[PDB]
Amino acid sequence: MSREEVESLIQEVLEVYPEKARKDRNKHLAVNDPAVTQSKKCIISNKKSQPGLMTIRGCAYAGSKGVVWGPIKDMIHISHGPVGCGQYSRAGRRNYYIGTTGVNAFVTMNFTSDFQEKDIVFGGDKKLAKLIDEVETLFPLNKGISVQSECPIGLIGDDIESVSKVKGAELSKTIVPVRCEGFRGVSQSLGHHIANDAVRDWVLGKRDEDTTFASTPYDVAIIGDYNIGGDAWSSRILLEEMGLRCVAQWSGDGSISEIELTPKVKLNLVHCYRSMNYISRHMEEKYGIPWMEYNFFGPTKTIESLRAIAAKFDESIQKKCEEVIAKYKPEWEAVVAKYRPRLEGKRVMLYIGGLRPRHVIGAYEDLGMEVVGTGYEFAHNDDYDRTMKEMGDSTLLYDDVTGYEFEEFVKRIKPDLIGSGIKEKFIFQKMGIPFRQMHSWDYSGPYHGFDGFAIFARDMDMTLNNPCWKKLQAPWE
Amino acid sequence: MSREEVESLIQEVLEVYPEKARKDRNKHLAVNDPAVTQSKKCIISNKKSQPGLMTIRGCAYAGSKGVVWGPIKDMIHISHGPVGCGQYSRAGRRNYYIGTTGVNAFVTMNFTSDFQEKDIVFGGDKKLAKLIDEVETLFPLNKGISVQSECPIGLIGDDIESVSKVKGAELSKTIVPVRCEGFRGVSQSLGHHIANDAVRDWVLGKRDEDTTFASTPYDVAIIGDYNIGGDAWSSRILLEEMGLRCVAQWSGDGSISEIELTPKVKLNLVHCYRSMNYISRHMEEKYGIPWMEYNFFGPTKTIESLRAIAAKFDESIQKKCEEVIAKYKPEWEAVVAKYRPRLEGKRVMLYIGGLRPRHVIGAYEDLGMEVVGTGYEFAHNDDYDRTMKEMGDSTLLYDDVTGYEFEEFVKRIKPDLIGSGIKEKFIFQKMGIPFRQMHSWDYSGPYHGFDGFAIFARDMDMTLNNPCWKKLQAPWE
Amino acid sequence: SQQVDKIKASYPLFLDQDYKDMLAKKRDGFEEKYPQDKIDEVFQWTTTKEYQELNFQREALTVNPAKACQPLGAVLCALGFEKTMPYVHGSQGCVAYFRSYFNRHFREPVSCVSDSMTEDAAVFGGQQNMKDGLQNCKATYKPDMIAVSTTCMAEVIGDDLNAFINNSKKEGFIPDEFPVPFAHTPSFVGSHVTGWDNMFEGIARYFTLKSMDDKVVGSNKKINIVPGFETYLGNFRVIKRMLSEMGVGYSLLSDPEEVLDTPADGQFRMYAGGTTQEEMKDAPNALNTVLLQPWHLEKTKKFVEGTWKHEVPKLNIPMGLDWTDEFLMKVSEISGQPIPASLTKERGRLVDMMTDSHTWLHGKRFALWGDPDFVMGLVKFLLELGCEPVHILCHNGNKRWKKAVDAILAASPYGKNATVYIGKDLWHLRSLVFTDKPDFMIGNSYGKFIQRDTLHKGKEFEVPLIRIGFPIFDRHHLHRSTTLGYEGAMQILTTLVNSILERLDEETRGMQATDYNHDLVR
Amino acid sequence: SQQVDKIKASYPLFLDQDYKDMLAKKRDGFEEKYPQDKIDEVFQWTTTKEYQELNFQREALTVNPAKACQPLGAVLCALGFEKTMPYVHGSQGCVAYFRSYFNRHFREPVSCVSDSMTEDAAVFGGQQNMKDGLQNCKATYKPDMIAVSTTCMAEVIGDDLNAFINNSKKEGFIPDEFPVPFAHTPSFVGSHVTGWDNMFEGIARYFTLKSMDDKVVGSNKKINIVPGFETYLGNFRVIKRMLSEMGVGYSLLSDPEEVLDTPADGQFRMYAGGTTQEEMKDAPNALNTVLLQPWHLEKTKKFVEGTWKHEVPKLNIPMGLDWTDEFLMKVSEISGQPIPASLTKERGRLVDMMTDSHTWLHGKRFALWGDPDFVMGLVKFLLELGCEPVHILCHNGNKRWKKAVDAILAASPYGKNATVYIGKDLWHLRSLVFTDKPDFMIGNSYGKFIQRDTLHKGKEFEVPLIRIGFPIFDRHHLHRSTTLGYEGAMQILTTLVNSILERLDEETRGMQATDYNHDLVR
Ligand code: CLF
Ligand code: CLF
Ligand SMILES: [Fe+2]
Ligand SMILES: [Fe+2]
């Protein structure tokens, strides 16, 4: 479609809305121009969702507990408030780890204060203090506790900070109050920020006066990789083959100690900008540690990233970088040779959270595919700035897309594949459009790095080319 | 029911039959008189079945291949003829063994010459010789082969004896021709006899001139226990705790060598009289080995049997006998204490093959149960002689019972439990009568010995008293 | 590394030596991990009676709950109405979760809206969110009814749903006649099943409270059926099937089976089937109202009895043999329809299956959990099978319900080793399956982690999970199954006996060791 | 020893130390057993390509066949007729086996008589056995029809069934007009399926050959359906269900589903349901005749075409999506009835399931066996699912059939690593699953021993069995399942995907080792 067809597509779709909603949604839909570097000239983002329009967004608790804190494997994370939020989010996100669950690691468990009426009426701080003692008795190898506030906590005026300080002091334990109530902000995004500031304020400074860490020139941390299906491990392997030492992973397969050791590193490598730029900036400000954005989706981006990272070190690392690249060349070339002919020319529309909607485009392009539409649940304009140069001219961008919009856009655009989430998957399959989950990787992955690209390619091929898609039309209709 | 009522019942049931069948069936049905010693005064047996009447009997191939030879674990038994007989009998009978199946033991496998039209028209002897070579190639650890003839072999004039001699000599292997074609005899019974004679003629004498086996005064063989669900093992354990050395088990868990060593024993202990009296008589005649009948069903019979066996030896064995009895006393007493109150007074009707219809009566009586009818598929009058004293006065006996007769007897007698086979089980369950399989033990057992009595009791109770039996009538009917 | 013709996903990729060595290095360098001997020591302690005692003393901490929150149940209830949009007044995070939770169980779209209240609504309340939300939802998704429930934020700040909806109509945001039934659904009271009761009662009141004067009990000659919170498609279907076979006029009130099972035919259907408005309006004219899951339909029952004047019969959930018989006999009584030959035969086929499978079922010991009616029906059927339901866990159960179940146990010798637990969670259940090991668990997918824990103690201590309940996320299409009626009992029987036989085959598969009992025929 | 409170059956009783020691002493003393190192050596050799080559060179020996003999199929065919007694002329040992084989699969009574020919019949033949047998059978069991087949003795001796039955009628042993259809069923020709075809064609001839001159094709407005040898109740049921919902008049010719599923209500029913004599007599008046399993109904087809003049359509077994589609479209064409909304939706629900489950099915490799039509339908559906049916074994298959299956494989990229085997047995299949290891086997209970053998080599080599086919003896009530139509395809899909996910859960259950991938949601 031309710029003008996409533009009239947007206008037609918005005709359904009452005027207030129509005027708002118009601001969140744009036709890409890769000439633009200021996205605040063409799309609005990180605003409230319009009531009743079936946003795909979640809340600040999802962005704090579900996203940032939950993966930290040797801490216990309390879903503090009523029973729902911890139950729906129990083991929904595939933030992989190595541990002995229920013993030294706790990620897929749901710890909750299960608020009842009396807790709402009289407050839950006494319950929280008792709950902490119960945790200590039954889970003695936990290395710290976080308190992930749900909607009621702030609303009823509880003081989880006092409880965390008093109990933390009494038990010589790191207990972290996190004010991530879902009434705060507009989406998962503010949850990330809240979570980052909680790490800063309650964990990150613990070893500030401790000089025992055996530091080297090659120490880095992977910042903002939550190890979905092992994504961080398939990144780490390459960084270490390149001669670097990955002191920490924030927060997929992450331990509290590796977080406390991060201020000792030489360089912070930021994959998820949206979720962990805040703490990255803090670390530069306080500790003088530089940070840099990278991308480990597909061979083209991965090679560029390895090279850009290696360039921050010495000749020995630059040399290893080229050895790594040479090692994996035949492997990814074989993936391309097998799968690109099966996918060349195919058109994809994406809708994801805060990073992937731009970050995966290169990987699609390494298989000859075109991303014809993309958008985010909860990105900010600094994300859109990074997106417009990665997308083609006259492609469709959508911020906090409504269910209606997404369906109507797909009907007109007729993508060969859609990459989005669980709430979207079954809608599009019924429409006869191959769908891949691009949050959970549809229970596959990893997708990061060279080993991830093989699985990514296999997966896009098995679904887009599956025999089922030829069968939706009964032969008598 | 009185004698006169049972006699009435028999005449009424016989009314359905045409005259020839009526006259015949009348001779196979009797009201027990335990005063009688010569059963040839009151019942006829081991005659042809009447056409069209739904006998429960099998054939001579079942008696030879299925019963006697099949359990021998380190030989390969060929079902020689068309594909049916070996397939229906594959792993149907639970003659347990210890081995590495397909490697050194072959019991649950089905080896067959799979006769086609060309084998019927031109003879299967060339195929058999080729088959033998193929067995040797593919199963090199087999310690002998038997050829279990199916119906066509004798009908078409094949000479499996010549093939067995010639190939056995060529390969220095025991290859045993067995003329157990199902057209022979009238039931499984003649298969037993044929099978015993084939052991005598082709296996049993192999070590007649070998003086290397070190015998002791306490050497015995268990003759006619096919180790159903482990029955022979739960017998052997007791014989050995009593100080005896069990050189052989014929044929449950049996090896060709232990069969060849049996002529070295001091005493043959016969459980199944019907199937192995023939070879027991032979061994007395030829080697001077005495034999005695025993019964390991229930504590009363097992205790009586242990004492009678021990009496054939010396004081040291009699002393160990009493030690064994003292050891197990509290065990079976606990079984009786738990289960007898659950079963006291309950009435059972049995129909089985050639031994169990009398042999299990004592075990039922050890739980306070009454066997009100019993009969056999293929027993001879020497079995009936042994039965009349074990059954109560005025009880019903049936030889080669027809399906019709068994149903009609059960409708009138209204037993609390029936003990029979797979072809009977589902009929009687639908009638609301608890049923236990008394061939296969309903996939349970062992039932022999003290350890088997516990399982027997558990099993009769779980089925007789099951809640399901209160539920056959819809509450609106 | 990858080999292109045999690509490895996470399992078994990370077992390659280079990944293993990398993970060992990460652990040793940076994780400051407890030594393996200490991990082993603590694990072993968590399997003990001493640990169980401490675990059962918990007052403040909940671990691995077996319940969810009210509005989840209101949403499922709402989905069962024709062209009805579930609408949860409050915080949007909640709706993302409710949709995803059901998406994963049904493998289907699940449509529901929020009105996206934010922190600002704490000053003023969410009235404006309701006005625009209702207008936007109606225009955009074109439902014929919007069924409104609440999230906990809206409950804590105290928003008056009734007044907000009335004001929405007064000021023209949606038409006066447009149906907007509502219910308050606080997550800190009861559980998801309570949300279902509250929503249903709100819908029933909406369509009937003000129009009672023309109603005559029995005048439509039908029986109303209220299913409660139900996540097996086969359960809505079997009840309709049985009633139709019996020639009984009925109205199934909340019937999502079509919208939870649309065909993949090239279009997306946001709505399908469902109870009609006309069925709700006419419901007081029924002969009576039968509650399939009475232990979570108490508020509904009071409304139906007090306002519709229906003499709701005292019936247990129709699970197992006796309770299916009782349901059919009562429906026969109310309707005047005889139980048909087809159902008599079906019953007898179930009984046949019980007779055929009883020897493997006898004495088998189960731990189990779920919602109260499901749990008690499962207990009853297990007793009918001669099984022992030794650990009966219902996190969201109550004292009156426990007393009822304790009485059912007392009516059978198969209940003598059984204990019923309420308010306890799957971490409590984990202890019980270690200290008083059963043969199997019957439960939802959260059970898999207990099985994992038991195997770690050793193969001989492993307790296999049999997946029956909600949610089931790690198997496909089990939501098509049936647990009610004779069909459901036949399905449960089959699953149970074959789970037993599968485990026995595993235990007897050892060459020359245990395969003496690896029988062809069982 | 036993402890009365926890009685041990064979497993695990014989693992007690005293039993273990006893069995060791028996071995060492008397068994002259090959040393364990030699056993291990030979086992390892039996898993090799070298051994496979020798195995596949067999010409005379058959090991672990995957077929049975003709009269088994005749008996099943005969059971499907109203008040019909199967009667096998010849040797009674055969009948004990046929009954027991079906008893174990259906867990039901199986009624069948012999006329008990003995050795003496070699001189004169079995004429007298037939006369008394027919008279005795009729008086005793009161069938309305006696359907006669033969055992191999009767075939070798050359007994003329037709003459023997005629002489029975002439001499008054059975009434002149009492129906005694017959078929020669030699066990040394073809297999059980051939017996079904022979019996069916014999019954068809009996009721129609002499009365053709009043017959008009199409005059009864029905379609005849011939199911062939079928051991899933759900298969008879789904065909009748689909035809009824389309409003198609039909006659199912051989329909045992009632007699193989009588209720346990306090009486035994020797006969139930079945195709009526009136249906067989009127069958040439149908519009046409559809064969559900054409690859074992070739004799029947020649008779229906040549004598009834029906233009029997070229249809595959209705298994999977395409072939169910084709069956319904052809039925629509013949009958004039459109495919209704209900079936269109059911189709779309299957397709939905396929879209939902495709990622776990994709590329999965299967070994499979069974009867020719079942095997080819399973192959087709597997290709539709994006699976690879790499070892396709049909012991009783023929060359023309193999060509057809090779053509199906060629129409799909998913067939490219597949090979079709005819005349080979489960000992041949055992080699294939060692040398070219698939993910799963789909087969009958005899497959369990192959799984046992694979595990002995190592857990990483184990090939789990998925039980679909006949006989299934070691699980309960699987004979109630369905494999035909959209319902059958849904059931097969569900079984396959969940077998995949069970195995994955097993492989990822290892604490701290593989449980990183023990996902709650799949
Ligand atoms: S935005 Fe929680 S699911 Fe809700 S009704 Fe309360 S218990 Fe239930 Fe985010 S923090 Fe959570 S998920 Fe919502 S409540 Fe707020
Ligand atoms: S009495 Fe065999 S089942 Fe028969 S028709 Fe021949 S192949 Fe088939 Fe006994 S030996 Fe065997 S089992 Fe019978 S045939 Fe004779
Ligand atoms: Fe779906
Ligand atoms: Fe049955």
Task: Return the HEC string of chain B.
Answer: CCHHHHHHHHHHHHCCCCHHHHHHHHCCEEECCCCCCCHHHCCCCCCCCCCCCCECCCCHHHHHHHHHHCCCCCCEEEEECCCHHHHHCCCCCCECCCCCECCCECCCCCEECCCCHHHHHHCCHHHHHHHHHHHHHHCCCCCCEEEEECCHHHHCCCCHHHHHHHHHHHHCCCEEEECCCCCCCCCHHHHHHHHHHHHHHHHHCCCCCCCCCCCCCCEEEEEEECCECCCCHHHHHHHHHCCCEEEEEEECCCCHHHHHHHHHCCEEEECCHHHHHHHHHHHHHHHCCCEEECCCCHHHHHHHHHHHHHCCCCHHHHHHHHHHHHHHHHHHHHHHHHHHHHHCCCEEEECECCCHHHHCHHHHHCCCCEEEEEEECCCCHHHHHHHHCCCCCCCEEEECCEHHHHHHHHHHHCCCEEEECHHHHHHHHHCCCCEEECCCHHHCCCCCHHHHHHHHHHHHHHHHCCHHHHCCCCCCC
In angstroms, the Cα distances linking A458 to A31, A452, C490 are 31, 10, 41
Q: What is the CATH number of the domain that holds D121?
A: 3.40.50.1980
Q: Taking a C-beta distance cutoff of 8 angstroms, is the pair A417, A464 a contact?
A: yes
Distance (Å) from the C-alpha of residue A111 to the closest C-alpha of chain C? 5
Report which ligand 2 atom has the smallest distance to the Cα of D72: 8
Query: Which chains touch B (3+ CB pairs under 8 A)?
Result: C, D
Residues of D in contact with C501 (CB under 8 A): 474-476
- Do residues D102 and D205 both lie within one domain? yes
The torsion angles phi and psi of D79, rounded to 5 degrees, stand at -55, -25
Give the three-state DSSP class for A173. Answer: coil
Whether A470 contacts chain D with CB within 8 A: no
> Which residues, 6+ apart, have CB-to-CB distance to A41 below 8 Å?
none
For chain A, the residue count is: 477
Task: Please give the sequence-ordered ranges of beta strands (E in DSSP) within D292-414, or none if there are none.
Answer: 365-369, 388-394
Domain contains B335: no
Residues A218 and A191 in one domain: no
- Count structural domains, chain B: 3
Spell out the residues 6+ positions from residue C123 whose beta carbon is closer than 8 angstroms to its own: none
Q: Which residues pair with residue B398 across a beta bridge?
A: B29, B375
DSSP 3-state assignment of A250?
Answer: strand
Q: How far apart, in whole angstroms, are the C-alpha atoms of residue A100 and residue C45?
A: 14
With beta carbons less than 8 A apart as the criterion, state whether B82 and D150 touch.
Answer: no
In a domain, C498, yes or no: yes
Residue B59 annotated to the active site = yes
Q: Which of B90, B151, B187, B194 to mutate to test the pocket of ligand 2 (most atoms within 8 A of CB)?
A: B151
CB of D14 closer than 8 Å to CB of B71 = no
Q: Centre a 10 Å sphere on the Cβ of residue C142 and count the other Cβ atoms it contains.
A: 13
Interface of C with D in 6-65 (CB under 8 A): 9-12, 14-15
Domain end (from A172, A202, A232)? A202
Is the Cβ atom of C70 under 6 angstroms away from ligand 1? no
Distance from C-alpha of C516 to C-alpha of C518, rounded to nearest angstrom? 6
Q: Does C490 touch chain B (CB under 8 A)?
A: no
Q: CA D93, CA B60: separation in Å to the nearest integer?
A: 8
The helix-helix angle for B403-413 and B422-430 (nearest 10°) equals 40
| C171 lies within 8 A of chain B by CB | no
Q: In what order do the strands lie in the sheet with C388-394?
A: C419-422, C388-394, C365-369, C440-443, C465-467
Resolution for this model in angstroms, one decimal place? 1.5
Minimum-distance CB partner of C521 among D15, D452, D474 = D474
B464 and B389, same structural domain?
A: yes
What angle is formed at CA B277 by the lines to CA B276 and CA B281, rounded to 5 degrees? 125
Q: Give the C-alpha separation, B307 to B316, whole Å.
A: 12
**Long-range Cβ pairs for the range D499-503 (8 Å, 24+):** D499/D440, D499/D464, D499/D466, D500/D360, D500/D361, D500/D364, D500/D439, D500/D440, D501/C474, D501/C475, D501/C476, D501/D360, D502/C475, D503/D439, D503/D440, D503/D464
Same domain for C153 and C265, yes or no, is no
Contact between residue A466 and residue A435 where contact means Cβ atoms under 8 Å apart: no
Per DSSP, the three-state class of A304 is helix
The whole-angstrom separation of Cα B114 and Cα D64 is: 11
The verdict on B425 touching D (C-beta cutoff 8 Å) is yes
Q: Which residues in chain C touch residue D521, judged by CB atoms under 8 angstroms apart?
A: 104, 445, 473-474
Could you tell me if the CB of D69 is within 6 A of ligand 2? Answer: yes
Judged by a CB distance cut-off of 8 A, whether residue D480 touches chain C is yes
Instruction: Assess whether the C-beta atom of D220 lies below 6 angstroms from ligand 2.
Output: no
Cα C387 versus chain centre, distance: 23
Surrounding ion ligand 4 within 5 Å at CB are C 352, 356; D 107-108
Q: What is the CATH number of the domain that holds C358?
A: 1.20.89.10
Q: Which of D295, D232, D190 is nearest to D76 (CA)?
A: D232
Question: What is the Cα–Cα distance from B44 to B30, expressed in whole angstroms?
Answer: 9
In terms of domains, do D304 and D336 share one?
no
Among residues D95, D137, D152, D248, the one annotated as catalytic is D152
Say if CB C19 and CB A233 are below 8 A apart.
Answer: yes
D94: chain B residues, CB-CB within 8 Å: 59, 84-85, 182
Question: Pairing between strand C388-394 and C365-369?
Answer: parallel
Residue D77 marked as a ligand binder: no
- Judgement on whether residues C453 and C508 belong to the same structural domain of the protein: no
Provide CB contacts within 8 A for D279, sequence distance 6+: D251, D253
CB-CB contact of C367 with C441 (8 Å): yes
Which three-class secondary structure state does DSSP give residue C520?
Answer: coil
DSSP calls for C245-258: HTT--EEESS--TT
Residue D80 falls within a domain, yes or no? yes
Q: Closest chain D residue to A446 measured between Cα atoms? A: D517
Using CA atoms, how far apart are residues B53 and C195, in angstroms rounded to an integer? 66
CA–CA distance, A136 with A142 (Å, rounded to integer):
8
Identify whether the C-beta of residue C158 lies closer than 8 Å to the C-beta of residue C117. no
The residue annotated as part of the active site, out of A28, A77, A93, A386, is: A93
Centroid of chain to Cα B197: 17
Nearest to C359 among B92, B442, B469 (CB): B442
Q: Are residues C492 and C516 in the same domain?
A: yes
Domain-embedded: residue A245: yes
User: Which residues are within 8 A (CB) of D17 and not within 5 positions of it... i.e. 6 or more apart?
Assistant: none
Residues of D in contact with A97 (CB under 8 A): 516
Domain membership flag for residue A367: yes
Nearest CA in chain A to C108: A426
Report the candidate in B177, B106, B156 with the shortest Cα–Cα distance to residue B135: B106
- C-alpha closest to that of B241 among B165, B317, B330: B317
Strand duo A29-31 + C365-369: pairing: unpaired
C149 touches ligand 1 (CB under 6 Å): no
Nearest to B145 by CA among B154, B132, B134: B132
Closest-approaching ligand to the CA atom of D268? 4
D19: Cβ below 6 Å to ligand 2? no
Q: Are residues A283 and A191 in the same domain?
A: no
What's the full length of chain C, in residues?
522
State the Cα–Cα distance between residues B328 and B332, nearest whole angstrom. Answer: 6
Residue D364 CA to residue D377 CA, distance in Å, equals 17
Q: For D317, what's the count of Cα atoms within 13 Å in the CB-facing half-sphere?
A: 31
Q: Give the domain-ending residue among D252, D287, D319.
A: D319
CA distance A350 to B416: 70
- The span from the CA of C394 to the CA of C425, in Å, is 8
Buried b (16+ CB within 10 A) or exposed e, C174-191: beeeebbbbbbbbbbbbb
Of A202, A231, A253, the residue that ends a domain is: A202
Q: How far is the CA of A71 from the centre of ligand 3 (A)?
A: 30
- Supply the DSSP string of C419-457, one letter for each residue: EEEES--HHHHHHHHHHT--SEEEE-GGGHHHHHHHHHH
Burial classification of residue D161, based on how many CB atoms lie within 10 Å of its CB (0-12 exposed, 13-18 middle, 19 or more buried): buried
Q: With b meaning 16 or more CB within 10 Å and e meaning fewer, what string describes A1-25?
A: eeeeebbebbeebbebbbeebbebb
The span from the CA of A346 to the CA of A344, in Å, is 6
C350 Cα to the center of ligand 4, angstroms: 9
- Residue A41 is assigned to a structural domain of this protein: yes
C145 in the same domain as C80: yes
Annotated binding residues of A, as ranges? Answer: 59, 85, 151, 272, 439
Spell out the residues 6+ positions from residue A358 whose beta carbon is closer than 8 angstroms to its own.
Answer: A374, A383, A386, A387, A390, A391
Burial A398-419 (b: 16+ CB within 10 A, else e): bbbbbbbbbbbbbeebebbbbb
Q: Are residues C267 and C281 in the same domain?
A: yes
Taking the CA atoms of A254, A260, A266 and A268 in sequence, report the sign of the dihedral they define.
Answer: positive
Coil, helix or strand at residue C168: helix
Residues B211 and B312 occupy one common structural domain: yes
Identify whether residues D109 and D93 lie together within a single domain.
Answer: yes
Ligand 2 within 6 A of D473 CB?
no
C226 to B259, B333, C254, C486: CA distances (angstroms):
71, 55, 7, 19
Which positions 35-74 of A are in contact with C (Cβ < 8 Å)?
A: 48-62, 74
Q: Return the exposure string of B446-457: e unless at least 16 CB atoms fall within 10 Å of the residue's CB, then b.
A: bbbbbbbbbbbb
Cα B120 to Cα B112: distance, rounded to the nearest angstrom: 15
User: In the structure, do chain A and chain B come into contact, i.e. share 3 or more CB pairs under 8 Å?
Assistant: no
Residues 82 to 121 of C: which have CB under 8 A from any D CB?
Answer: 104, 107
The secondary structure of D115-126 as a DSSP string is: ----TTHHHH-S
Q: Residues with Cβ < 8 Å from B189, sequence gap 6 or more?
A: B46, B63, B274, B354, B378, B379, B380
User: In DSSP terms, which residues pair with C146 in a beta bridge?
Assistant: C85
By Cβ distance, the residue of C344, C351, C520 closest to B471 is C351
Q: How many CB atoms lie within 10 A of CB C347?
A: 27
Report the DSSP pairing between strands B267-270 and D388-394.
Answer: unpaired
**Same structural domain, B208 and B176:** no
Contact A113 C60 (CB under 8 A): yes
> How far, in Å, is the centroid of ligand 4 from the Cα of D483?
20
Domain count, chain D: 4
Domain end point (choices B317, B351, B386) = B317
Contacts of C27 in chain A (CB under 8 A): 98
CA distance B129 to A25: 87
Residue linked to tokens 């009588």: D262
A59 within ligand 1 shell (Cβ under 6 A): yes
CATH code of the domain containing B417:
3.40.50.1980
d(CA C10, CA A234): 9
Name which of B90, B96, B466 is nearest C516 (Cβ-Cβ). B96
Q: Which of D456, D444, D463, D327 is nearest to D393 (CA)?
A: D444
CA distance C516 to B253: 10
Instruction: Name the 3-class secondary structure at C146.
Output: strand
Give CA–CA dist B20/B9, Å, rounded.
19
Gyration radius of chain B over CA positions: 23
Pair D81, D195 in one domain: yes
Cβ–Cβ contacts within 10 Å for residue A295, how many?
A: 21
Does a structural domain hold residue B286? yes
Sign of CA dihedral C439, C443, C445, C450: negative
* Catalytic-residue membership of D156: yes
The torsion angles phi and psi of C200, rounded to 5 degrees, stand at: -60, -45
Strand partners, C224: C251, C289
Q: Which residues of C touch A185 (CB under 8 A)?
A: 118-119
- The DSSP bridge pattern shows strands A267-270 and A219-225 to be parallel
Strand partners, C89: C150
**Rounded Cα distance, C38 and A141, in Å:** 9
Strands of the B267-270 sheet, one edge to the other: B245-251, B219-225, B267-270, B291-293
Nearest Cα to Cα of residue C319 among C388, C380, C390, C253: C380
Same domain flag for A350 and A472: yes
Contact D463, D499 (CB under 8 A): no
* Among candidate residues D249, D225, D246, the one with its CA nearest the CA of residue D486: D246
Q: Is the domain of B226 the same as that of B305? A: yes
Task: Report yes or no: C361 at the D interface, CB cutoff 8 Å.
Answer: no
Q: In terms of Cα–Cα distance, which of A471, A469, A446, A450 is closest to A459?
A: A446
The answer to whether the CB atoms of C384 and B429 lie below 8 A apart is no
d(CA D77, CA D200): 6
Chain D residue closest to B453 (CA)?
D2
Q: State the Cα–Cα distance between residues B331 and D3, nearest whole angstrom.
A: 7
Q: Is the CB of D100 under 6 A from ligand 2?
A: no
Structure tokens at D206: 């009996």
Among protein residues, the one whose CA lies closest to atom 4 of ligand 2? D94
Tokens standing for A130?
A: 């008792």
Same domain, A260 and A365: no
Regarding whether A469 and A424 lie in a shared domain, the answer is yes
Do C349 and C497 sit in the same domain of this protein? yes
A436 DSSP assignment: E
Looking at the DSSP bridge assignments, the partners of residue C369 are C393
Does residue C474 sit within a domain?
Answer: no
Structure tokens at B457: 């009791």
Q: Does A448 lie in the same domain as A416?
A: yes
Alpha carbons C162 and C201: distance in angstroms, whole number: 14
In this structure, are residues D514 and C15 in contact, taking their beta carbons and an 8 Å threshold?
Answer: yes
Structural domain that includes position A10: 1-59+342-476
User: Does a structural domain hold residue C149?
Assistant: yes
The answer for residues whose C-beta is within 8 angstroms of residue A80's C-beta and 6 or more apart is A112, A113, A124, A128, A147, A148, A149, A150, A153, A160
Domain co-membership, D77 together with D168: yes
Helix axes B273-287, B381-388, angle to 10 degrees: 110
With a CB cutoff of 8 Å and minimum separation 6, the contacts of C115 are A51, A52, C87, C88, C89, C90, C126, C129, C130, C132, C133, C134
Contact B262, B286 (CB under 8 A): no
Chain length of chain B = 477
Same domain, B216 and B106: no
The answer on D459 and D376 residing in a single domain is yes
Residue C60 lies in a domain: no
Residue after which a domain boundary falls, among C188, C214, C240:
C214
Confirm if A317 and A242 have CB atoms less than 8 A apart.
Answer: yes
**In this structure, are residues B248 and B261 in contact, taking their beta carbons and an 8 Å threshold?**
yes
Which chain D residues are closer than 8 Å to A99 by Cβ?
Answer: 512
Residue that the structure tokens 């010798």 belong to: C413
C-alpha gyration radius of chain C: 25
What is the helix (H) or strand (E) element at residue A406, kind and residue range?
helix A403-413
Distance CA B282, CA C4 (A): 70
- C-alpha A466/C-alpha D360 separation (Å) is 12
Check residue C34 and report its DSSP letter. Answer: P
Domain final residue pick, C155, C183, C214: C214
User: A422 and A437 share a domain?
Assistant: yes
State which residues form the domain around C164. 69-214
Radius of gyration in angstroms for the set of CA atoms belonging to chain A, rounded to a whole number? 23
Q: What is the distance between the terminal CA atoms of chain C, rounded to a whole angstrom?
A: 46
Distances (CA, A) of C287 to A133, C221, C334: 56, 6, 7
Residue C117 Cβ inside 6 Å of ligand 1? The answer reads no
Measured at the CA of C273, the angle between CA C270 and CA C277, to 5 degrees, comes to 105
